[PDB]
């Protein structure tokens with residue numbers, strides 16, 4: 001239930017909150033809303049045990 | 050430490066402090082009654098024998 | 099809509115802090131509108147988004163009280179708490195709540211989660227009104243001033259310092275902004291702030307009466 005953001009396009013300003021979850025693309029081929037090759041969702045759980 | 054005196058300074062309503070050349074507090078606004086009070090130091094000087 | 103261009107004419111100076119100073123020359127650094135700049139005059143009879151590039155100076159020389167409120171944000175079609183300001187003859191209720199509102203903001207004289215619900219005196223009462231908005235460290239600051247312009251031809255000469263009214267405690271990612279209109283036309287100036295250095299002049303009453311822009315010409319650099 002606890003998530004964190006792996007990566008963004010740029011840095012974060014102080015006291016700035018980001019809510020919108022868009023599939024990041026790190027290549028020329030667009031993601032088009034599909035988490036396929038070279039398309040990763042930025043929100044991944046901590047996994048506390 | 051100082052002597053508090055009633056003033057005639059034209060404080061704008063968003064201003065609460067006054068500052069001098071050396072950035073010391075010259076006038077202050079009382080938080081209970083909306084009044085302007087000047088702060089002047091107590092009497093002092095040199096002594097020669 | 100129609101775009102024109104006008105010299106700013108040493109206009110758009112605000113009080114940099116809430117400290118009374120009198121009979122002193124003070125040198126400050128903030129986000130100021132530079133002197134003799136190139137502001138844009140918009141005539142609204144007709145509307146893409148306008149950039150918010152490190153702060154916006156806003157002015158209007160309208161007597162009929164038609165321009166009413168602003169919206170700030172990035173997308174402005176729902177999806178994000180953005181801003182909302184309504185200024186009628188009644189109170190001046192500011193909201194952060196989005197509305198999913200149309201691309202032609204006309205008012206008729208015939209939403210979602212909410213954050214801020216301020217109610218204050220009427221802003222709008224020869225009634226030139228200047229506004230300055232800025233976004234630093236997640237804080238939204240608003241400065242305003244009413245000026246009785248005599249000859250209504252352009253932005254007048256002289257000095258009129260801008261005093262703060264409202265400090266909103268939060269705001270994130272403002273890049274675009276728009277205006278709103280009232281129908282049963284509109285004409286406003288938009289200038290962009292920039293981190294310049296100013297030499298402010300205070301009189302005996304604590305009122306800013308003159309300023310020097312330290313990066314305009316070599317004479318003002320010598321004065322600074």
Ligand SMILES: *[C@@H]1O[C@H](CO)[C@@H](O)[C@H](O)[C@H]1NC(C)=O
Pocket residue numbers: 081082
């Ligand atoms: C605090 O004192 C001032 C001065 O008498 C008064 O006007 C104000 O109502 C007081 N505040 C409260 C909460 O009683």
Ligand SMILES: *[C@@H]1O[C@H](CO)[C@@H](O)[C@H](O)[C@H]1NC(C)=O
Pocket residue numbers: 103104105136
């Ligand atoms: C402002 O910029 C426009 C852009 O082309 C230019 O035509 C105009 O002359 C400029 N105004 C000045 C330099 O006063």
Ligand SMILES: *[C@@H]1O[C@H](CO)[C@@H](O)[C@H](O)[C@H]1NC(C)=O
Pocket residue numbers: 301302303
């Ligand atoms: C300060 O304000 C008073 C009150 O109107 C005025 O008489 C005086 O001329 C002002 N001082 C200036 C403008 O230097």
